[PDB]
Amino acid sequence: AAYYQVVPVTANVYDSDGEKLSYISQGSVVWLDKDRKSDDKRLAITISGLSGYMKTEDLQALDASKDFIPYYESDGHRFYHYVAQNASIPVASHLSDMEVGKKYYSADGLHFDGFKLENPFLFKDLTEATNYSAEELDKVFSLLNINNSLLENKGATFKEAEEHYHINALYLLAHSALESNWGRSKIAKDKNNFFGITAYDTTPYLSAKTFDDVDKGILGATKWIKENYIDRGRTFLGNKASGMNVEYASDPYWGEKIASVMMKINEKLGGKD
Ligand SMILES: CO[C@@H]1O[C@H](CO)[C@@H](O[C@@H]2O[C@H](CO)[C@@H](O[C@@H]3O[C@H](CO)[C@@H](O[C@@H]4O[C@H](CO)[C@@H](O)[C@H](O)[C@H]4NC(C)=O)[C@H](O[C@H](C)C(=O)O)[C@H]3NC(C)=O)[C@H](O)[C@H]2NC(C)=O)[C@H](O[C@H](C)C(=O)O)[C@H]1NC(C)=O
Ligand SMILES: [Ca+2]
Numbered sequence: 042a043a044y045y046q047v048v049p050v051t052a053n054v055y056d057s058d059g060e061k062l063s064y065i066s067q068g069s070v071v072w073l074d075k076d077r078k079s080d081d082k083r084l085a086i087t088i089s090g091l092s093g094y095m096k097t098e099d100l101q102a103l104d105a106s107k108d109f110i111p112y113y114e115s116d117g118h119r120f121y122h123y124v125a126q127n128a129s130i131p132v133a134s135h136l137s138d139m140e141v142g143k144k145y146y147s148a149d150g151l152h153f154d155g156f157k158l159e160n161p162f163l164f165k166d167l168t169e170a171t172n173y174s175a176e177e178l179d180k181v182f183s184l185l186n187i188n189n190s191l192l193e194n195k196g197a198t199f200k201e202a203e204e205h206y207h208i209n210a211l212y213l214l215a216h217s218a219l220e221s222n223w224g225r226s227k228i229a230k231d232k233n234n235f236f237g238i239t240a241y242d243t244t245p246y247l248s249a250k251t252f253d254d255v256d257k258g259i260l261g262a263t264k265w266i267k268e269n270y271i272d273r274g275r276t277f278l279g280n281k282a283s284g285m286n287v288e289y290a291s292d293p294y295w296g297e298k299i300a301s302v303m304m305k306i307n308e309k310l311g312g313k314d
Contacts, residue, residue: 042073042102042103042104043072043073043105044070044071044072044073044102044103044105044108044110045070045071045073045084045086045095045100045101045102045103046068046069046070046071046100046101046103046108047065047066047067047068047069047070047071047099047100048067048099048100048101049067049099050066050067050242050243051064051065051066051067051242051291052064052065052095052096052099052100053095053096053099054086054088054091054093054094054095054281055083055093055094055095055096056093056094057094062091062093062281062287063091063093063281063287063288064291065088065089065281065291065292065293066242066290066291066292066293067242067291068125069088069291069292069293070088070103070109070110070111071084071086071087071088071095071100072086072087072088072148073085073086074086074087074092077092081097082096082097083095083096083097084097084100087148088148088281088293089148089149089150089280089281089282089286089293089294090148090149090151090279090280090281090282090283091280091281091282092282109125109126110146111123111124111125112144112145112146113132113144113145113146113147113150113153114129114142114143114144114145115135115136115139115140115141115142115143116135116141116142117135117141118134118135119131119132119133119134119135120132120133120134120135120136120139120158122150122294122297124294124297124298130294130297130298130301131301131304131305132150132158132160132297132300132301132304133158133159133160136156138155138156139156149280149282150280150294150297160297160300162278162299162300162303162304162307163277163278163279163280163284163296163297163300164277164278164279164284165209165212165277165278165303166276166277167208167209167212167271167276167277167278167285168207168208168209168271168276169209170203170207170209170210171203171209171210171211171212171313171314172313172314173196173210173211173310173313173314174196174200175196175197175199175200176196177196177310177313178196178199178200178210178211178214178306178310179193179194179195179196180310181214181306181309181310182194184309184310185305185306185309187218187223189225190223190224190225191224191225191229191230191233191235191255192214192217192218192223192224192235192255192259195255195256195259196210196214198255198256198259198260199213199214199259201260202259202260202263203263205260205263206263206264206266206267206271207267207271208263208266208267208271211303211306211307211314212278212299212303213259213262213263213266214306215299215300215302215303215306216236216266216299217235217236217259217262218302218306219295219298219299219302220235220236220237220240221234221235221236221237224255227246228240228245228246228249231246232249232250232251232252232258233251233252233253233254233255233257233258234249234250234251234252234258234262235258235259235262236262236265236266237249237290238250238261238262238265242291250265270285270288270289275287275288275289277296278295278296278297278299278300279296280293280296280297281293284296
């Protein structure tokens with residue numbers, strides 16, 4: 042088969058030496074890499090920019106004529122990644138080279154056969170501050186119809202986090218928006234944890250860190266990201282080959298999802314970043 046799906050809760054991706062490179066989530070679809078040798082025990086695969094090996098034990102072959110394979114498609118305005126059969130995210134503007142309503146396939150969401158995407162928020166250095174003020178960030182709740190969020194009117198706390206820890210406040214708002222459903226998840230409400238801090242795939246709610254209030258949750262999560270990711274040389278969102286997505290989340294499209302939210306906010310607020 043050309044495509045395989047991950048069966049266990051997570052599965053590792055290995056290099057040719059058998060060293061772990063990353064891990065990916067249950068249901069993730071990987072491509073067989075025909076330029077490298079596979080055998081009975083391990084398949085050469087590609088996922089989210091990463092070329093490595095996976096154990097056959099962890100995979101199930103798909104038939105693309107009847108099983109869901111992630112793809113990209115333009116509506117003529119935006120280019121969308123269907124990350125799941127019933128979920129799409131906008132990743133880029135429509136290019137003239139895209140046929141509307143045609144399915145396109147890509148192992149990294151940047152290289153296509155007939156065009157190349159810029160996803161600049163995916164590779165942006167997150168130590169550079171946003172050009173949005175606290176009041177501008179606060180406006181996005183009304184502009185994107187975000188109701189009942191714990192993060193409403195916390196633009197000033199995001200900008201303090203940025204000032205103190207030197208982490209981009211648009212990124213911190215987009216990460217909390219994606220990870221905690223705009224501070225509306227049960228982890229957000231019970232634990233003031235908007236960033237999935239230690240929300241491990243095996244037991245996400247139980248493992249998730251507890252913070253004292255919303256402001257200490259924003260500041261404490263920012264400290265945790267600075268100390269565990271930025272200070273360790275993971276300074277952009279990226280994918281399974283580089284960036285925070287290598288370690289932060291099993292989801293191969295976590296970085297692309299946060300970049301998409303940054304793109305959507307930036308557009309609504311007038312494109313200052
Ligand atoms: C839109 O819904 C949201 O989707 C998000 C994905 O797009 C989803 O993300 C979930 O978030 C957490 C943080 O990203 C993430 O947790 C990581 O889990 C792995 C374990 O599976 C941790 O790695 C282990 O770490 C220990 C200690 O370091 C190691 O000993 C161990 O070997 C590691 N295991 C492996 C297999 O390598 C990882 O820890 C890293 C390495 C770390 O400590 O820095 C965890 N990350 C963090 C930051 O703690 C999890 O993978 C991810 N889930 C998916 C599918 O990606 C949101 O989840 C939230 C948290 C929630 O459910 O409320 C989704 N949000 C909602 C509202 O649904
Ligand atoms: Ca190696």
